[model samples]
Target: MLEGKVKWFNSEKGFGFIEVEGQDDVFVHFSAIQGEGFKTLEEGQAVSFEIVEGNRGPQAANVTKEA
Candidate 1:
């Protein structure tokens, strides 16, 4: 898994971007977030996830909040 920070998120839109050092921002969809019930990411929150080749390009998957 790779680590990054939530660049920004739109709960209403159900998508966001993750800031990974030395790489382009990774797209994050609500469905990729790991949690029960309402799933969303907060801007600037630390998280861990895997990079996958999404239909649109690089995207984050199996995302989890970090301590």
Candidate 2:
């Protein structure tokens, strides 16, 4: 898994970007977030996730927010 911070998320759009150090922003879809209820990410929130090659490009998977 890779650690990073949330750049921004659009709940209505169900997608966002994560800012990983020393790397370009990784795309994150709402479905990738791990949790019950609404899946969303806040700006600057700490998180960990797996990197995968998405249909568009590099994407985040199995995302989990950190305390």
Candidate 3:
């Protein structure tokens, strides 16, 4: 899993970007959020996720908030 913080999320659009450390921001969609949690994300919220190669670029998968 990769550590990062939420850059921003648009609930209505169901997409966001994660400001991953040491790499370009990773793309995130509502589907990526795990644990049946809120489909929205707070800016700067600490999170962890797996990286997957998306058609356009890197995308975040299996995202979850860090304890």
Candidate 4:
């Protein structure tokens, strides 16, 4: 998994962007979040995820927030 920080997140829309070191921001969705309870992320939140190449661009999968 690649380590990154949540650039920005929209809970209502359930989407967000993650900033990975030495790489472009990766697209993320609430569906990809892996954790207990209501999944939500805030800007600047630390996280880790896998990078997958989607048709549009790089996407973050299996996203998990760090405590």
Best by lDDT: 1
Query: How well does candidate 4 match the true structure in TM-score terms?
Result: 0.89
Each candidate structure's TM-score, on Cα atoms with residue i matched to residue i, is 0.91, 0.90, 0.86, 0.89
**How well is each residue in 1-67 modelled by candidate 3, as lDDT tens digits?**
8899999988789998999768998889988888775677878788999889958777899999885
Report the error of model 4 at residue 57, Å.
Answer: 3.3
Q: Name every residue pair that clashes in candidate 2.
A: none
- Sort all candidates by lDDT, best to worst: 1, 2, 4, 3
lDDT of 2 by residue, 6-44 (tens): 999987899999989889999999999998889998998
N/CA/C clash count, model 3: 0
Candidate with best TM-score: 1
lDDT digits (tens) for residues 1-67 of candidate 1: 9999999999899999999998899999999999787899999999999999947788899999895
Q: What would the TM-score be for candidate 3 when compared with the true structure?
A: 0.86
Candidate order by TM-score, decreasing, is 1, 2, 4, 3
- Report the CA-based lDDT of candidate 4 relative to the real structure: 0.90
Predictions: Cα RMSD each: 1.1, 1.2, 1.5, 1.2
Q: CA shift at 62, candidate 2, in angstroms?
A: 0.7
What's the lDDT for residue 8 in model 1? 98
